[PDB]
């Protein structure tokens, strides 16, 4: 229902060495379609999805120098923060930026964002109105002044509501062509003799897409939210994801428990018993 297009930039600032200085990855929902990086006069790119080739070499060449120019800008603003807290310039630091937009065909909702983080911490983020910024520390307040003065905020709003959104709807049309709507999870439940007695019932969900999913265990209709162990959703490696939910049940009472799987690639929630 809700689809996103997002760019994840990681730039490294280390005035003491060479420069595999920036990588930027782009995703359509949970699928990466491209990786740009500084390797090349103005970077280089590498696609990773069929529904992206349709754009052509001219397009992707332009898209790459744009990403590169953004990466240089992102990286350069670090300086404002170093001068304020008077840190050395030869020191190493990390700059991360994520920006993107999303659409919800249902209610045709649109949202966008752009957040910068220096050395693993918040620095500045664009507000929902796409007209103002939230500063995390004092140095970021300086950056905020500079960007409004420079017109940086409007440039971004224009990109977010214009090409970002246009690219999301296009890339989406494209995908409908080759890959199917979603990817339903294959499910089954394992068990495991618990060294401390009783058993662990484990409910698995594999090969699903997108990554969002909910795995629950019930007993007589109640969600066992506090006796349920969940692992972080993880990549199968083939563009698909996996997850499992476990519950410790008292010996002999296995058949009383049922697992509920909620996923958008399922017209209805899946129920599995031991």
């Amino acid at each position: 229902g809700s689809h996103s297009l997002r760019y994840f930039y990681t730039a490294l600032s280390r005035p003491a060495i060479s420069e595999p200085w920036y990588i930027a990855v782009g995703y359509l929902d949970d699928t990466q379609f491209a990786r740009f990086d500084s390797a090349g006069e103005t970077g280089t790119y590498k696609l990773s999805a069929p529904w992206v080739e349709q754009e052509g070499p001219e397009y992707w060449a332009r898209e790459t120098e744009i990403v590169t120019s953004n990466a240089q800008f992102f990286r350069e603003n670090l300086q404002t923060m170093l001068d304020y807290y008077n840190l050395s310039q030869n020191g190493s630091h990390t700059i991360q930026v994520m920006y993107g937009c999303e659409v919800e065909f249902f209610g045709s909702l649109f949202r966008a964002y752009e957040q910068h983080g220096y050395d693993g911490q918040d620095y500045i983020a664009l507000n929902e109105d796409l007209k103002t910024w939230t500063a995390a520390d004092m140095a970021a307040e300086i950056t905020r002044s500079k960007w409004e003065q420079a017109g940086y905020t409007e440039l971004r709003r224009t990109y977010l509501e214009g090409p970002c959104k246009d690219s999301l709807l296009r890339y989406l049309e494209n995908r409908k062509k080759t890959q199917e709507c979603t990817d339903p999870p294959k499910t089954h439940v394992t068990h495991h003799a618990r060294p401390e007695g009783d058993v662990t019932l484990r409910c698995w969900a594999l090969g699903f897409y997108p990554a969002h999913i909910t795995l629950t265990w019930q007993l007589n209709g109640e969600e066992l939210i506090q006796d349920t162990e969940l692992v972080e959703t993880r990549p199968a490696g083939d563009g698909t994801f996996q997850k499992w939910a476990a519950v410790v049940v008292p010996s002999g009472e296995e058949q009383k428990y049922t697992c509920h799987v909620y996923h958008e690639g399922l017209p209805e929630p899946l129920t599995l018993r031991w």
Partner: protein, 99 residues
């Protein structure tokens, strides 16, 4: 300033003694992004292991997926050892077919 790596070691498909498969090593929640990930066979560092492009989450912590090929055996130990500045010592997690 720096967070420590969480590691998951698992297979692409339901494991089956003797039958060929793919071993994944998903490393998350770490910072800075400089890291060293090794996939091992019976304690012997496995060769050419592919990696995904690095990305990060809302809290700025990074994540990467290292993955190779392997064939589940009751007599075969597979593990993933990662080296990161946030820890006092390298960290190894063994593949366990139940998880």
């Amino acid at each position: 300033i720096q967070k420590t790596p969480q590691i998951q070691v698992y297979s692409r498909h339901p494991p089956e003694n003797g039958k060929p498969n793919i071993l994944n090593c998903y490393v998350t929640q770490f910072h800075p992004p400089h890291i060293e990930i090794q996939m091992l066979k019976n304690g012997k560092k496995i060769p050419k292991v592919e990696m995904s492009d690095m990305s990060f989450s809302k809290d700025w912590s990074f994540y990467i997926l290292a993955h190779t090929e392997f064939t589940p055996t009751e007599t075969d130990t597979y593990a993933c050892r990662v080296k990161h500045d946030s820890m006092a010592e390298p960290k190894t997690v063994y593949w366990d077919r139940d998880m």
